[PDB]
Ligand binder design. Structure first.
Ligand SMILES: COc1ccc(Cl)cc1NC(=O)Nc1ccc2nc(NC(=O)c3ccccc3)sc2c1
Length: 289
């Protein structure tokens, strides 16, 4: 545990932001955290119990978070383990999760009024893709990549996480098996559902489905279908349709992520490359896409 630590007295709770079965999130002020801010806002996760079950999973999640740090991964500042309750401290991300942001832009300080423009939808996709290049670079497999597990900050910075609360707030996006197991079948490729195999390449398939959620402003993939009807479609090889707002050039990058054979899918590095070049493209070019 080369994990950073914060003293209880440096954290001041303001109010609740959200709740899962195994946690609560608060907005707080953290003192003496950054040289040139002596006062800044953060999001704090309180652990429900402090047993054998939940305290080992805590110091494991922390070690993971400290090693994962990059421009498009959520910023983890460290733990407070003096008395209870055990707290993890993160960067505050003012627009909340990317699914909720997409749905309420389908005007302000950070975004124009009306629906998000082609250049904005590309800027979001390109950022999530840069996160998945760093993770695939450390040979780390996510297993739950979707818009509900990304966050949006001031100036539309977009960063990946993996939040405990997503099974609680968004249970409709999971199929329940056995007792306490939940699978995001709408976001999984055929080899994940049939053979239970999870790879770098099942992540790019999931990225494909994220790019689809972005270009439908937060729509549930296969929303017309029961969980069993969605598994039948995916295993029999059927593809999600091109969203209206989706240019054919972009729907071609989605298709590249959905090639039935894992080893025929484009690498995430090529996908980020295609998306960043587009997001940065001169307007004269985006206008006729
Ligand atoms: C196995 O763990 C991982 C593996 C791989 C990755 Cl890349 C990340 C994780 N872990 C997390 O990402 N953890 C997490 C959990 C809850 C939570 N609550 C937040 N919620 C707000 O910060 C929030 C912000 C604005 C409004 C409301 C809530 S951050 C967070 C991260």
């Amino acid at each position: 545990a080369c994990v950073h630590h914060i003293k209880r007295r440096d954290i001041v709770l303001k109010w609740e932001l959200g709740e899962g079965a195994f946690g609560k999130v608060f907005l707080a002020e953290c003192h003496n955290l950054l040289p040139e801010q002596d006062k800044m806002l953060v999001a704090v996760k309180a652990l429900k119990e402090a047993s054998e079950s939940a305290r080992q999973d805590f110091q494991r999640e922390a070690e993971l978070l400290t090693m994962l740090q990059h421009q498009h991964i959520v910023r983890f500042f460290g733990v407070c383990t003096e008395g209870r309750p055990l707290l993890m401290v993160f960067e505050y991300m003012r627009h909340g999760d990317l699914n909720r942001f997409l749905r309420s832009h389908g005007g302000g300080e950070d975004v124009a009024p009306g629906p998000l423009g082609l250049g904005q939808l590309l800027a979001v996709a390109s950022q999530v893709a840069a996160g998945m290049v760093y993770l695939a670079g450390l040979h780390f497999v996510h297993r739950d990549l979707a818009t509900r597990n990304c966050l949006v900050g001031q100036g539309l910075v977009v960063k990946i996480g993996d939040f405990g609360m997503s099974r609680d707030i968004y249970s409709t996006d999971y199929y329940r098996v056995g007792g306490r197991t939940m699978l995001p079948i709408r976001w999984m490729p055929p080899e994940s559902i049939l053979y239970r195999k999870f790879t770098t390449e099942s992540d790019v398939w999931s990225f494909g489905v994220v790019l689809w959620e972005i270009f439908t402003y937060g729509k549930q993939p296969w929303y017309q279908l029961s969980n069993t009807e969605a598994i039948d479609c995916i295993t029999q090889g059927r593809e999600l349709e091109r969203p209206r707002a989706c240019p054919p050039e972009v729907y071609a990058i989605m298709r590249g992520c959905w090639q039935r054979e894992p080893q025929q899918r484009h690498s995430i590095k090529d996908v980020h490359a295609r998306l960043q070049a587009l997001a940065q493209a001169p307007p004269v070019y985006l206008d006729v896409l």
